[PDB]
Every structure is written in structure tokens, then in C-alpha cells.
Design an enzyme around this catalytic site. Sequence first.
Site, short mmCIF file in Angstrom:
data_model
loop_
_atom_site.label_atom_id
_atom_site.label_comp_id
_atom_site.label_asym_id
_atom_site.label_seq_id
_atom_site.Cartn_x
_atom_site.Cartn_y
_atom_site.Cartn_z
N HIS A 125 45.63 56.42 18.31
CA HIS A 125 46.89 56.07 17.62
C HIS A 125 47.97 55.53 18.56
O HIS A 125 48.95 54.96 18.09
CB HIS A 125 47.48 57.27 16.86
CG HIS A 125 46.60 57.79 15.76
ND1 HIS A 125 46.18 57.01 14.71
CD2 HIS A 125 46.07 59.02 15.55
CE1 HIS A 125 45.43 57.73 13.90
NE2 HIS A 125 45.35 58.96 14.38
ZN ZN Z 1 41.43 61.71 13.40
#
Ligand code: ZN
Length: 356
Positions: free
Chosen positions: A133
Site C-alpha cells: 500500500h
Molecule cells: Zn491485505
Amino acid sequence: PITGLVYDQRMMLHHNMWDSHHPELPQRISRIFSRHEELRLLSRCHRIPARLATEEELALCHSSKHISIIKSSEHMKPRDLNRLGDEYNSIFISNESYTCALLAAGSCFNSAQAILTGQVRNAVAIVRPPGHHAEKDTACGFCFFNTAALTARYAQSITRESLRVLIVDWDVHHGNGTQHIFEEDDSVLYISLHRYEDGAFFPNSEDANYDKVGLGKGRGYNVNIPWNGGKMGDPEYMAAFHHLVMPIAREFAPELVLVSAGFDAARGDPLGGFQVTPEGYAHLTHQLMSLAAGRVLIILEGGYNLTSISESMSMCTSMLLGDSPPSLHLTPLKTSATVSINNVLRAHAPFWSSLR
Ligand SMILES: [Zn+2]
Ligand SMILES: [K+]
Ligand SMILES: [K+]
């Protein structure tokens, strides 16, 4: 014909001082490491040392501002750690976080180096905090620096800039950071399978949809396989690999395969709500081993059920070591999974002859 393994208990130091039950637990990595020892997998691997990534290596994907801000957390008092963490989506920070994030990345660089110099054929990296992320300029979703993306760039930095790297992200969440870092790049093929639910599932962006296929010279080199309509498992993952991941990967002909290997699509995971089995992960791994002359590096991302992740990642290492895949895809697909696979097929047939 050797499998490398990297693990350093120092990566456990990163912790949540306000919520000791936050699912991204220190013992995620020690439990996985223990299970490798228990199943006598550890003694069969070549142990690769952890190291710190350098700030210059971090700058392969991240801004100098981002690097310095996360570095500044090393000497912060709890109030300022809380304030800084809160500036991001779903981040906690302790004084040890920066060091741990450097060790996770450096560990994977050493593993990629071991593979690319021929010291080992393939490798597994038992690391935290996770990476996929993390964006060029920001932290997100338990991630500080994008370990897998950095490793792809590191690999190119010791071979050639255009080294073909396939990143397969089977963490149940979309790797928004990885997609963005490589979105205009045809040297790195990003393939992600992830729960999507039309944007209701973290990280809640339409960037994760099947129609996001890459930009510019990277058009066609971003493959999103989004799941909608609840629980998926081995049949759906095996079908996605059969119809999409493997034909595209074979056509790409990667020279290195990196797996953003979250185990939160696993049966028992509290965040993923899916039911991929350890045997299922073994078969996914075994398929990827047919690529890039076996040059595969499995990098831990998410996965929050300690038993599930320990069993699942150990099964992946068992495959890397050359063990026979376990008996397994017991069922017709959920209809929405068929729809997802067909949507991705339609989106990528213009770019990949293997889908036509
Ligand atoms: Zn994940
Ligand atoms: K994913
Ligand atoms: K790409």
C-alpha cells in the site's frame, strides 16, 4: 537448486503502543518462522542475512520527503508518533518502525541478489511491516515503504533497467502503491487479485478495478482481478491463475518473479473473509515456479490469522524446495467470480494474444 530464506526477529520491534491487539502483530513473523522450523523446512533452506536498506535504495521508489518524515519518527515521543501516524490512512508508528521497514526491504534486496547472482534458485522473505500500500510519497495500510516495488527496482539496478519483473500480488487487498509506482512502466508487470466490492473494500478506490490496465508505454502491464459478492476460495483463485495470471505471465516472459504474498485471503483471516487453503497457496506457488527459470521471491505482505499464515506460507516454501504439490479446486465458481474473470479477459485481450 537451493531455496533461500530471510528472517530477522528485530522486525518484531515495530509495534502499536496504543492497541496491542492491532492485527499487524509482531508475532506474525515469529509464528511463520517457527512453523518453518517445526516442519523442518528451515533446515533445508539457505539462510540469507537481513540488512538495512539504504536511503538511496529507498529513493528508487520514494520521495526524499517521505523517507525523511518516516525517518524522523525514530526519536519521537508517543504524542508525536500518534500525530504522525494519524496523518496517514491506517498507520501506527513506534520508534522502531523505520528500522523495521528498512530491514524488511534490505532483506528482500539480499534475497533478490542471492537469486540473481545464482546463489539460490528461489527464496522466501518473512518480513514486516508490509509494503504494497505504500506510495511514492506516503505511508498507507500498515505499510511504510513499498518493499516489493523497491525490490523490483533494486533487481533492475544490478542487472539492467529493462529487466522484466513480474509482481504477482495475491494479498486480498489491492496493492495501490505498487500499481501506481509501475503504472507507466512496461518493464514491470503488476498482477493483483483482490477483494474489491465495487470500492467498499480497503483501500476503497476505483483504481483497483479491472479496467485500470496501465498508462502510456505501460498500457497492458497492469492487471487487476477484482472480486465482488463475498467469499472466494481455491476454485476462484485457481481459475484466475488458469485463465489470466499464467497465460499473461508466460507471454510477458519475466526474468524475475516477485510475489506480494499476503495470506489474508486465507481461510480464517479476520480481514479478508475468504477461504483459500494452504494447499491452494501451494498450487499458486508451484505454478509461478514455472516462470523465469524458477526465479521466484515470495515476500510476506498481509495475513492476520497467525495459524493460517504460518501454515500457508510454510506450504509455499515447501513448494519452492521442490516438494510435490498436495492434493487439491473442488468446485464450480461463484457466478460473480466468473463475471470478474470475464471482465478482466475483455479488458486485456487487446494487449495479450494469449487471451484471444
Ligand atoms: Zn491485505
Ligand atoms: K492483491
Ligand atoms: K506496470
